[PDB]
From Swiss-Prot, chain B:
Similarity comment: Belongs to the RNase PH family.
PANTHER family, alphabetized: EXOSOME COMPLEX COMPONENT RRP42 (PTHR11097:SF8), EXOSOME COMPLEX EXONUCLEASE RIBOSOMAL RNA PROCESSING PROTEIN (PTHR11097)
Other comments on record: Present with 7110 molecules/cell in log phase SD medium.
CDD domains: RNase_PH_RRP42
Family annotation (InterPro entries): Exosome_comp_Rrp42_subfam, PNPase/RNase_PH_dom_sf, Ribosomal_Su5_D2-typ_SF
Species this protein is from: Saccharomyces cerevisiae (strain ATCC 204508 / S288c) (Baker's yeast)
Keyword Cytoplasm: yes
Gene Ontology biological process: exonucleolytic trimming to generate mature 3'-end of 5.8S rRNA from tricistronic rRNA transcript (SSU-rRNA, 5.8S rRNA, LSU-rRNA); nuclear mRNA surveillance; nuclear polyadenylation-dependent rRNA catabolic process; RNA catabolic process; RNA processing; rRNA catabolic process; TRAMP-dependent tRNA surveillance pathway; U1 snRNA 3'-end processing
UniProt protein name: Exosome complex component RRP42
The entry's keywords: Cytoplasm, Exosome, Nucleus, RNA-binding, rRNA processing
Subunit organization: Component of the RNA exosome complex. Specifically part of the catalytically inactive RNA exosome core complex (Exo-9) which may associate with the catalytic subunits RRP6 and DIS3 in cytoplasmic- and nuclear-specific RNA exosome complex forms. Exo-9 is formed by a hexameric base ring of RNase PH domain-containing subunits and a cap ring consisting of CSL4, RRP4 and RRP40.
Top-level taxonomic group: Eukaryota
Swiss-Prot record, chain C:
Organism: Saccharomyces cerevisiae (strain ATCC 204508 / S288c) (Baker's yeast)
Function recorded in the entry: Non-catalytic component of the RNA exosome complex which has 3'->5' exoribonuclease activity and participates in a multitude of cellular RNA processing and degradation events. In the nucleus, the RNA exosome complex is involved in proper maturation of stable RNA species such as rRNA, snRNA and snoRNA, in the elimination of RNA processing by-products and non-coding 'pervasive' transcripts, such as antisense RNA species and cryptic unstable transcripts (CUTs), and of mRNAs with processing defects, thereby limiting or excluding their export to the cytoplasm.
Gene this protein is translated from: SKI6
Primary location: cytoplasm
Record text on subunit structure and interactions: Component of the RNA exosome complex. Specifically part of the catalytically inactive RNA exosome core complex (Exo-9) which may associate with the catalytic subunits RRP6 and DIS3 in cytoplasmic- and nuclear-specific RNA exosome complex forms. Exo-9 is formed by a hexameric base ring of RNase PH domain-containing subunits and a cap ring consisting of CSL4, RRP4 and RRP40.
Family statement drawn from the similarity comment of this UniProt entry: Belongs to the RNase PH family.
Subcellular location: Cytoplasm; Nucleus, Nucleolus
Name recorded for this polypeptide: Exosome complex component SKI6
From Swiss-Prot, chain F:
Name the UniProt record assigns to this protein: Exosome complex component RRP43
Organism listed in the record: Saccharomyces cerevisiae (strain ATCC 204508 / S288c)
Gene that specifies this protein: RRP43
Result for mutant: residue 129 to F: Interaction with RRP46 abolished
Subcellular location, record wording: Cytoplasm; Nucleus, Nucleolus
Additional observations: Present with 3180 molecules/cell in log phase SD medium.
Pfam family, one: RNase_PH
From Swiss-Prot, chain H:
Subunit organization: Component of the RNA exosome complex. Specifically part of the catalytically inactive RNA exosome core complex (Exo-9) may associate with the catalytic subunits RRP6 and DIS3 in cytoplasmic- and nuclear-specific RNA exosome complex forms. Exo-9 is formed by a hexameric base ring of RNase PH domain-containing subunits and a cap ring consisting of CSL4, RRP4 and RRP40.
GO cellular component terms listed in the entry, alphabetical order: cytoplasmic exosome (RNase complex); exosome (RNase complex); nuclear exosome (RNase complex); nucleolus; nucleus
GO BP annotations listed: exonucleolytic trimming to generate mature 3'-end of 5.8S rRNA from tricistronic rRNA transcript (SSU-rRNA, 5.8S rRNA, LSU-rRNA); nuclear mRNA surveillance; nuclear polyadenylation-dependent CUT catabolic process; nuclear polyadenylation-dependent rRNA catabolic process; poly(A)-dependent snoRNA 3'-end processing; RNA catabolic process; RNA processing; rRNA catabolic process
UniProt name for this protein: Exosome complex component MTR3
Source species of the chain: Saccharomyces cerevisiae (strain ATCC 204508 / S288c)
Gene name linked to the record: MTR3
Length: 49, 263, 241, 228, 297, 305, 227, 209, 221
């Protein structure tokens, strides 16, 4: 029962134990913005219809 | 190695009513061969078979005197195929089948190998395949059949009953006795759709659905019977009435093959 | 206790001290199995030689960008003697030594540098064996290589000489090889230069030059016989075709 | 100045920043500075390193090396710096005044004098046949004829960088010669006559077998008298 | 990599030095290297040094059963397995390669087939019990000439070995401890020694095969650098009774027969000196042991 | 959220998985820190003397054992031979058994390092434990005369013992399981009686009569293993620990400090292996391991028949 | 009506009823019943039957109530880098370990590769497929790292040896390697360590940056998007 | 032997209808497994089979999968290498007709069978073939490999016949010794055994989910 | 005492030779070099270890010795400094110094010491220093003997091998690399044996430091 209530942390991606909420929020905010490929693909639409 | 289009064309030709073979042969017709015998003076018997496509086999027969109470089997076959390992699966399968077809009670008359109430001759069969392009079971069988019918053995001249008083066996220094044992023959068949084929070629084996191995001895079908896969990309199941057809075909056309190997 | 060399100058089989055994050879005996082939009969010896190549290598590891790779395989059957052999000879050290010696002999003679990125394979089958088998192997390889149309500098001929007390005997058989020491030679063309020299038993130091000279003359005669056979076959081939 | 062993205390104040040289390791887990080699520790903006004995070369940027061409590819050569080591690469555009029409003409088996330009840990090292830092071309290229001598790394460093090492001066007092020194453990020499080159080869081998630099002159005199 | 790379300059330099009668290490064309032999504390423990080549040998024995075919003889075997200790160009387990097979066959023909050891003296009870003798050769450092060093080491170790004294007590046998009944040596019938020659072509192949002059070059006991550039090789074994034990020239550069006979005649002067040196060293070791045992009384 | 199954996580990042599991008080094998696996055995069911009234005549097996621990199965069988013997607590008076070990992992070929090392260590530990005296393998041969055999209530002979061990469904190190299975199989061996009819004397084994094998029953020991891990502060979920009976992929890949013990119920020890390639090993952990191994051996000794 | 559960050899439906098309886990087989030819879709797996419209209908059998192929998602480990490509080894195919047994402990003590022990020289080549612990291999070309600016990609600024990377299969390739791509926002590095595998784990901070928690050092990667 | 401990060289070896139970999936480090155990009046047999794959293969590109079958003794070494290899070849011929090999390009499948137990409670390898076929079918179904049909077999007087498609097709035929004129009776008896084995196999697959 | 020599072979990177009573071992080291494709490790150095006996051919007895040597040597080397490279280590036993049919601990200790000396001579990065001794417990007297002779091994009750790790000038014990005990013993005997072995190992490592400094210093300027 310990494993069932402790999922999404026992089997997740690595996040450091003592991470301040500010740093976590900054990390989350970066990935909510376009990736380098997204910007280039956005502009190429006008060229190749 | 064949392409998809070639295989489709060949299968459409072979699985038709009536069947069409690539060289125009009949379903029961064999290909020409050449036979030579008695060309290794140091052996008791020998033969060489050359097929029309380059396949070649050489057989040697040698003997030894043994105590037939300790020794259980008086016929032993050893097979060597050029380009294959000594422990290859096909080599050992052929060795096992050929030792089974020449066992003690199979139609082979082993009473002709007995000298003295205690001793007997043991026969060694050595097979060397120089070149081959398909399953060489029937070629080796034909070569063994040819070699065994031209074998001569030393003649005993020193007593026969030695249960109480035993003397070393002694043989005449010039004379020999022809061996008149009864050797069997092994046939291989191919299944292509609803047809049965005798003596299949290399390209016909690449499209066959299955195959059969049938033994023959002095007018009757003999025990060793197997189903064999002649390829790995087209093997499928077959209906039971094709087995009976193959047995009848071998029974009908075996005597003609016997007359072709005479002398 | 036998008369190896009688006071009348005769050996056990009726030959004299400087006579070769019967020598018969055939060329192009297996057209469907190899590019070059030969069948050699020297006394009671029987050998089949096949030459495959030049051709694409099987593996990308055995590829050379400057010359061809040469391989030799020798198979000695279980029925080649009077007594049947108990086990196989495929992986014996003696057979590996023979194969290495043949490869190193023929590396210097074949122009391997004009066939880069290829492989040449030699397969040999010995059916009957009655003494002096190494020279027969050399002669068969030479004939099969020439039959395949592969460039070389000259012929190589094999021969065996036995020394019986003070008497040299040429081209010995199994009976003589079990009663005296022997020497095997490989001679290039019509010269005095040796490609192979093999002595396996004891021989006095002051008795080797005479044996070498006798063997060299015998090998020259062997080369003459091989050349005559090759010319006759070529004449027959070109006369009609 | 002092002899040190792996696992010993490092005698440097932790406050002062010191740049680390060969033989000194910074632990990636504890961030601790410790020595890993045996030898003499030299401390000079100050730099510390350990001088230790070695024979197997490891590429490092700005080193002068001598290599052998072992293979030609579509755009570069394959070069060996030592037997049984991983090979390095020399680019066709790494020659002076190089262009797609002015191709190099080196073959498999040639000797080359070059400089290490790239030594990334995750990649294969690269060499060039001209000093790109300064634009100078001082002796880089093919070495024709001559003979090659194998030595250890400390000896090669002493020959290349120390001007008080007396071997070249004592050799110049017997003959005129050309020389190239590689830090991978190679020395190339050439004279006008083969006997002089042979005497130089023997002298260099014998001097490297020894450790005393005061016996070089006697060795050279004896070797050059031997060849008559 | 496992490949030893040689540049064109080195090959050209060495061949041109051979054209002017020069060797890199200062020897003449017919000069053999100096041999050092050292004996260990136990019997059959020998170290052999030839310039920079180092070889170690060990002899041992134990009780076994004779073969059914030959019930009057003991057993003798020789093992030579090479390791990367002698050089990184050698594989760990490789007994099928060309050079290893050739070396093993040459040593076997020189020592075991020639009957240098008396195997009929190894029989204890005819048909049931005998001695089995082993020779183990360890290769420590390679600068050429393993065959000659191995032959010398094996022969010296065989001539240095002693085996425990035994007695037959009815059906079984008793093996006495060494501190009781003075172990005994083996019987040696002759002492064979091998010599190796190397051949170089200063011209092309056409001159070697069709030319009239014979300008080939022969040297004795090549080093590692020299034997990586040779075109042929010859090994001959001889004893002091002027007997040719074996000759091996397995292909390579074709050579005129008179030159080969000259090589065979040059080897004898070397083997005589080597035999005398071995005998003197063995005598000195025996005297040293006897003197120490007397002083320890 | 992005999540991986436990097997995938153990395959791609075993150290992180082990650190995450330990901070919760559990193990990736789902046990407590000092908890062992349960053991069930089945003795002497494949031997020719398995049925006391009906003796198999085509069977040459003298002793047997089948062991189950978790998901791993071990099968052990023992056979025999006879050799003619021509020519205290010291080790010169003791014998051993010759084992051959097969671990089924999907490979065809020769033996691996694991099998060879396990076989050699089994042989050596049997020899060092003073379990099998040499006088316990001496043959008291009889004679058959006109036909009946008379036993004594010239030449000499000794017994030779061989073992074959097959491991199925391996999940971790298996030396302890093999040793314990072989210990169970040795206490059930029966030696057949032998009689006799350049000389040729042939010794023949009796078809149904046998005698038991006499071993030092106070020298029998049982095996266990332990591991030591150092905790990583940055990997703990929302100092060193001691772990018993290592199992599963994550533990075998990440732990490099281990302890192995052979302990006898009498109170002494027969084997001890310390290998510190990871965290530091202190005397307290050694003492704790010794106590735990004593308890485990006491449990394993008095558990069956 | 269609069956609910299936086993190998179980007939499902005829070709018409709508034209039925066999999907994964099914096959089309000729049958002869009562002297007349019959066509049917036959299950090849144990599982449940589901049909989706793609008229043409696709019939599939899904296990429950492998081998990599084009379009699959895999987890890999980087082995080698060069200027043109990256070499990886495949560890899991769609959240299932491949192979089941990795061979840990087969070579004894220490840290050894799968083929670095004594058993690698005695493997029977002609009697099996591959040796214990062998895996599928793949190649990522520099032009496949991303979809844009695929001519200025620096490989060592994207991956390092020892990293865990999520990729997608493009082609079966030759007999040695598959061909893989990471040109999507959810593909890239998921696990990495500082100091080229000698340090501790790092955590993703931006699309092209990772950070070490113990010491605030940063390195460049091509980070796969978390959450 | 340098890799095994075989003991002293001079030692000599000592010289002195059917009810089934089927279970699958009990071996951890493989892909699929099965246990077959059969008992009657005068015989008793136990078998274990394991499947490894699909896995990588050495060589050049192949468009379809490859199958390898290995037979091993157990406890008692009652058979030699040649007959075991012949039976393996026969089984490989059978199972090349039922596996959908076109689904697994450039990969291999390895199958291991262990002959654990075989006792006579009251011509010997032929009667063991049907149980091997049943075990291999069960393990292949457990591992998730695609099969076009469930293959079974029967034995009658030295003849072994393997069926698919409710006994209307033949995938394998074996005959040693026996009567020459007895062919129809053998087919009927083998089919009668095959139907029962097929029922039991389907029940085992359906129940143990 | 012990005798050790450094740098005696010509075609390897490093070599040594260790003698202790009647036990003699010679070792060589070559690396870092290019490995085979199947030995390669992505991030660290790989090892290849070979041990050869004094008589006969190598068997499974030498495999255990190779395994223990690999266990001891792996934590000593700074393996992460040489990614995907190889180091070859070969040990040849010249004289066993004991009865090989029963005991193998003296050979193990001598091999450990010789391999450490060869690694120092080659120039491989090392974390610390090492030393190894054999120990035995004799019957009747129940005395603990450090460095037993061959006669004392024949009347022993248990035999032990201890290898330790030293830092900070050879005065601080960092870890226990290997302890291998076989026989019959209790806890008090074990904890007395460890205490004696630590002092003996400290003396040995001091002696080894002196030998290394004597040999290496003339090669530098």
């Amino acid at each position: 029962l310990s494993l069932k209530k402790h999922n999404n942390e026992l089997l997740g991606i690595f996040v450091p134990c003592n991470l301040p909420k500010t740093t976590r929020k900054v990390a989350i905010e970066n990935f909510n913005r376009p990736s380098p490929d997204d910007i280039i693909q956005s502009a190429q639409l006008n060229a190749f219809n | 190695s064949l392409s998809v289009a070639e295989k489709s064309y060949l299968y459409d030709s072979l699985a038709s009513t009536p069947s069409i073979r690539p060289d125009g042969r009949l379903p029961h017709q064999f290909r020409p061969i050449e036979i030579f015998t008695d060309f290794l003076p140091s052996s008791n018997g020998s033969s060489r078979i050359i097929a029309s496509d380059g396949s070649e086999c050489i057989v040697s027969i040698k003997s030894k005197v043994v105590d037939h109470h300790v020794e259980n089997e008086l016929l032993q076959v050893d097979v060597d195929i050029a380009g294959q390992r000594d422990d290859a699966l096909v080599v050992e399968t052929i060795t096992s089948l050929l030792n089974k077809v020449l066992k003690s009670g199979s139609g082979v008359d082993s009473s002709k190998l007995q000298l003295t109430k205690k001793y007997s001759f043991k026969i060694f069969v050595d097979v060397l395949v120089i070149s081959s392009h398909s399953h060489p079971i029937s070629l080796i069988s034909f070569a063994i059949y040819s070699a065994l019918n031209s074998t001569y053995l030393p003649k005993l001249i020193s007593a026969f009953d030695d249960l109480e008083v035993e003397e070393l066996p002694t043989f005449h220094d010039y004379d020999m006795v022809k061996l008149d044992i009864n050797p069997p023959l092994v046939f291989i068949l191919a299944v292509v759709g609803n047809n049965m084929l005798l003596d299949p070629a290399a390209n016909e084996s690449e499209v066959a659905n299955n195959g059969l191995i049938i033994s023959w001895s002095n007018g009757k079908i003999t025990s060793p019977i197997r189903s064999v896969a002649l390829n790995d990309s087209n093997v499928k199941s077959f209906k039971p009435h094709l087995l009976k057809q193959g047995l009848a075909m071998v029974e009908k056309y075996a005597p003609d093959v016997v007359r072709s190997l005479e002398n | 206790r036998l008369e190896i060399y009688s006071p009348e100058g005769l050996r056990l089989d009726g030959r004299r001290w400087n006579e070769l055994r019967r020598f018969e050879s055939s060329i192009n005996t297996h057209p469907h199995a190899a590019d070059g082939s030969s069948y050699m009969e020297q006394g009671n010896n029987k050998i089949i030689t096949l030459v495959k190549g030049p051709k694409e290598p099987r593996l990308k590891s055995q590829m050379d960008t400057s010359k061809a790779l040469l391989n030799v395989s020798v198979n000695i059957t279980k029925f080649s003697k009077f007594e049947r052999s108990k086990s196989s000879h495929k992986n014996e050290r003696r057979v590996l030594e023979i194969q290495t010696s043949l490869v190193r002999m023929f590396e210097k003679n074949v122009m391997l540098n004009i066939y880069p990125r290829t492989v040449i394979d030699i397969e040999i089958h010995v059916l009957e064996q009655d003494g002096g088998i190494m020279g027969s192997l050399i002669n068969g390889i030479t004939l099969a290589l020439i039959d395949a149309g592969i460039s070389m500098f000259d012929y190589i001929s094999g021969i065996s000489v036995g020394l019986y007390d003070t008497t040299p005997l040429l081209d010995t058989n199994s009976l003589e090889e079990n009663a005296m020491s022997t020497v095997t030679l490989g001679v290039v063309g019509k010269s005095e230069k040796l490609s192979l020299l093999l002595v396996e038993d004891k021989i006095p130091l002051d008795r080797l030059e005479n044996v070498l000279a006798i063997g060299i003359a015998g090998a020259h005669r062997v080369r003459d016989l091989m050349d005559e056979e090759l010319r006759k076959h070529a004449q027959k081939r070109v006369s009609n075709a | 100045s002092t002899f040190i062993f792996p696992g010993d205390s490092f005698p440097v104040d932790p406050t002062t920043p010191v740049k680390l040289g060969p033989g000194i390791y910074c632990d990636p887990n504890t961030q601790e500075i410790r020595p890993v080699n045996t030898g003499v520790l030299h401390v000079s903006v100050q730099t510390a390193y350990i001088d230790y004995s070695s024979k197997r070369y490891i590429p490092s940027v700005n080193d002068f090396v001598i290599g052998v061409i072992i293979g030609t590819f579509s755009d570069s050569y394959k070069v060996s710096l030592q037997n049984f080591s991983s090979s390095v690469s020399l680019s066709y555009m790494a020659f002076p005044n190089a262009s797609k029409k002015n191709r190099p003409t080196l073959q498999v088996g040639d000797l080359v004098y070059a400089r290490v330009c790239t030594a990334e840990k995750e990649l294969e090292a690269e060499i060039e046949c001209f000093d790109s830092t300064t634009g100078r071309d001082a002796g880089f290229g093919i070495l024709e004829d001559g003979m090659i001598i194998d030595v250890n790394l400390n000896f090669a460093r002493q020959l290349l960088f120390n001007n008080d090492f007396p071997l070249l001066k004592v050799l110049a007092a017997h003959t005129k010669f050309e020389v190239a020194i590689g830090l991978n453990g190679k020395i190339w020499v050439k004279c006008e006559e083969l006997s002089n080159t042979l005497a130089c080869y023997r002298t260099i081998m014998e001097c490297c077998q020894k450790n005393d630099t005061a016996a070089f002159k006697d060795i050279a005199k004896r070797q050059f008298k031997e060849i008559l | 990599a496992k490949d030893i790379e040689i540049s064109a300059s080195e090959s050209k330099f060495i061949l041109e030095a051979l054209r002017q009668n020069y060797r890199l290490d200062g020897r003449s064309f017919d000069q053999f290297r100096d041999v050092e032999i050292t004996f260990g504390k136990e019997f059959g423990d020998v170290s052999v040094k030839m310039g920079n080549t180092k070889v170690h040998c060990r002899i041992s024995c134990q009780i076994a059963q004779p073969y059914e075919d030959r019930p009057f003889e003991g057993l003798f075997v020789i093992s030579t397995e090479i390791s990367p200790m002698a050089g990184s160009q050698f594989e760990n387990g490789n007994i099928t390669g060309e050079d290893e097979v050739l070396c093993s066959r040459i040593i076997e023909k020189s020592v075991r087939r020639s009957g240098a050891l008396d195997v009929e003296g190894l029989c204890i009870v005819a048909g049931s019990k005998c001695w089995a003798v082993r020779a183990d050769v360890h290769f420590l450092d390679c600068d050429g000439g393993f065959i000659d060093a191995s032959c010398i080491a094996v022969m010296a170790g065989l001539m240095h070995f002693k085996k425990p004294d035994i007695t037959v007590h009815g059906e079984q046998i008793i093996v006495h401890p060494v501190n009781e009944r003075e172990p005994v040596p083996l019987g040696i019938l002759h002492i064979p020694i091998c010599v190796t020659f190397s051949f170089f072509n200063p011209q092309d192949t056409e001159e070697n095969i069709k030319g009239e002059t014979n300008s080939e070059i022969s040297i004795i006991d090549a080093t590692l650098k020299e034997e990586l550039l040779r075109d042929g090789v010859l090994t001959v074994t001889l004893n002091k009774n002027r007997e040719v034990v074996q000759v091996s020239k397995a292909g390579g550069l074709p050579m005129d027969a008179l030159t080969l006979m000259k090589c065979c005649h040059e080897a004898y002067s070397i083997i005589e000196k080597i035999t005398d040196q071995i005998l003197q060293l063995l005598k000195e070791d025996s005297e040293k042991r006897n003197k120490y045992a007397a002083m320890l009384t | 959220p992005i999540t991986f199954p436990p097997e995938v996580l153990a395959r791609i990042s075993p150290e992180l998985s082990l650190q995450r599991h330990l901070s919760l008080g559990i193990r990736p094998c789902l046990r407590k820190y000092e908890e062992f696996r349960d053991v069930a055995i089945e003795n002497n069911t494949l031997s020719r003397y398995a049925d006391a009234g009906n003796i198999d005549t085509k069977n040459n097996i003298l002793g047997s054992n089948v062991l189950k621990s978790g998901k791993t199965i071990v099968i052990t069988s023992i056979t025999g031979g006879i050799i003619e013997e021509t020519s205290e607590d010291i080790i010169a008076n003791y014998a051993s058994v010759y084992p051959v070990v097969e671990v089924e992992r999907g490979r065809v070929g020769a033996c691996t390092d694991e099998e060879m090392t396990i076989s050699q260590k089994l042989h050596d530990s049997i020899l060092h434990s003073r379990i099998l005296p040499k006088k316990a393998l001496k043959v008291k041969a009889g004679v058959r005369s006109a036909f009946s055999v008379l036993y004594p209530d010239k030449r000499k002979w000794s017994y030779v013992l061989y073992a074959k061990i097959v491991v199925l469904s391996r999940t971790g190190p298996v030396f302890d399981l093999c040793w314990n299975s072989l210990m169970y199989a040795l206490q059930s061996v029966k030696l057949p009686r032998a009689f006799i009819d350049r000389e040729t004397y042939e010794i023949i084994c009796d078809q149904t009569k046998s005698v038991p094998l006499m071993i030092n029953a106070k020298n029998i020991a049982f095996a266990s293993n332990y591991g030591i891990v150092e905790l990583d502060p940055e990997c703990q979920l929302q100092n060193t620990v001691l772990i018993a009976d290592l199992d599963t992929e994550a533990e075998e890949t990440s732990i490099h400090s281990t302890i192995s013990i052979l302990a006898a119920p009498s109170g002494n020890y027969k084997q001890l292996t310390l290998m510190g390639g990871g965290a530091k090993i202190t005397p307290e952990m050694i003492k704790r391991s010794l106590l735990l191994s004593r308890v485990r051996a006491d449990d394993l000794s008095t558990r069956f028949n | 009506q269609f069956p609910e559960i299936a086993y190998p050899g179980k007939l499902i439906c005829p070709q018409y009823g709508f034209n039925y098309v066999p999907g994964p886990g099914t096959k089309l087989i000729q049958y002869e019943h009562n002297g007349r030819t019959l066509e049917a879709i036959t299950a090849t797996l144990v599982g449940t039957v589901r049909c989706e419209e793609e008229k043409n209908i696709l019939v599939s059998v899904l296990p429950g109530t492998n081998l990599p192929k084009e379009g699959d998602i895999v987890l890999t480990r980087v082995t080698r880098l060069s200027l043109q490509r990256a070499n990886v080894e495949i560890l899991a195919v769609e959240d299932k370990p491949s192979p089941i047994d990795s061979g840990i402990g087969s070579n004894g003590s220490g840290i050894v590769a799968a083929g670095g022990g004594s058993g690698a020289a005695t493997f029977s080549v002609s009697q099996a497929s591959s040796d214990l612990g062998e895996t599928f291999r793949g190649i990522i070309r520099s032009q496949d790292v991303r979809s844009t600016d695929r001519d200025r990609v620096k490989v060592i600024e994207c991956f390092k040896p020892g990293d865990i990377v999520r990729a997608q299969v493009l082609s079966l390739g030759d007999g040695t390697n598959y061909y893989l791509t990471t040109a999507r926002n959810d593909l890239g590095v998921v696990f990495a360590r500082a100091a080229n595998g000698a340090g501790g784990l790092m955590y993703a901070t931006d699309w092209q940056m990772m950070t070490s928690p113990v010491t605030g050092a940063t390195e460049k990667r091509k980070c796969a998007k978390p959450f | 032997d340098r890799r095994r401990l075989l003991g002293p060289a001079a030692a000599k070896p000592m010289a002195f209808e059917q009810e089934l139970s089927l279970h699958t999936g009990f071996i951890e480090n493989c892909n699929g497994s099965a246990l077959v155990e059969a008992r009657s009046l005068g015989h008793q047999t136990s078998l274990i089979t394991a499947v490894y794959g699909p896995r990588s293969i050495r060589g050049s590109f192949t468009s379809q999968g490859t199958i390898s079958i290995q037979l091993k003794n157990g406890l008692l070494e009652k058979y030699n290498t040649n007959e075991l290899k012949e039976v393996s070849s026969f089984l490989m011929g059978i199972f090349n007709s039922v596996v959908n090999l076109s689904r697994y390009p450039k990969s291999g499948i390895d199958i291991f069978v262990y002959l654990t137990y075989d006792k006579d409670l009251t011509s010997q390898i032929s009667s063991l073939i049907p149980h091997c076929i049943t075990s291999i079918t069960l393990a292949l179904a457990d591992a998730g490999i695609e099969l076009v049909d469930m293959a079974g077999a029967g034995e009658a007087n030295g003849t072994v016949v393997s069926f698919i498609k409710n006994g209307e097709e033949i995938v394998g035929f074996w005959k040693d010794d026996g009567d020459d004129e007895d062919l129809l009776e053998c087919l009927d008896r083998c089919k009668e055994q095959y139907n029962r084995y097929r029922d039991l196999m389907i029940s085992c697959l359906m129940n143990q989910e | 005492s012990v005798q050790a020599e450094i740098g005696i072979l010509d075609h390897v990177d490093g070599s040594s030779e260790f003698v202790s009573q009647d036990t003699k071992v010679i070792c060589s080291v070559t690396g870092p070099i290019e490995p085979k494709a199947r030995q390669e490790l992505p991030t660290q150095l790989a090892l290849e270890i070979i041990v050869r006996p004094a008589k006969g051919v190598a068997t499974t007895r030498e495999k255990v010795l190779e395994d223990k040597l690999r266990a001891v040597l792996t934590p000593l080397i700074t393996r992460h400094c040489y990614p995907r490279q190889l180091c070859q280590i070969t040990c040849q036993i010249l004289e066993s110094g004991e009865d090989e049919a029963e005991f193998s601990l003296r050979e193990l200790s001598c091999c450990i010491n010789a391999a450490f000396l060869a690694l120092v001579d080659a120039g491989i990065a090392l974390n610390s220093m090492c030393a190894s001794i054999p120990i035995a417990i004799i019957k009747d007297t129940s005395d603990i003997i450090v460095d037993p002779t061959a006669e004392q091994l024949k009347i022993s009750l248990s035999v032990h091998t201890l290898a330790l790790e030293f830092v900070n000038g050879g005065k601080v014990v960092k870890n226990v690399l290997l302890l291998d005990s076989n026989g019959d013993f209790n806890e008090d005997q074990l904890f007395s044996l460890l205490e004696l072995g630590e002092q003996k190992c400290q003396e040995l490592v001091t002696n080894i430091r002196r030998i290394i400094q004597d040999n290496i210093s003339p090669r530098l300027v």
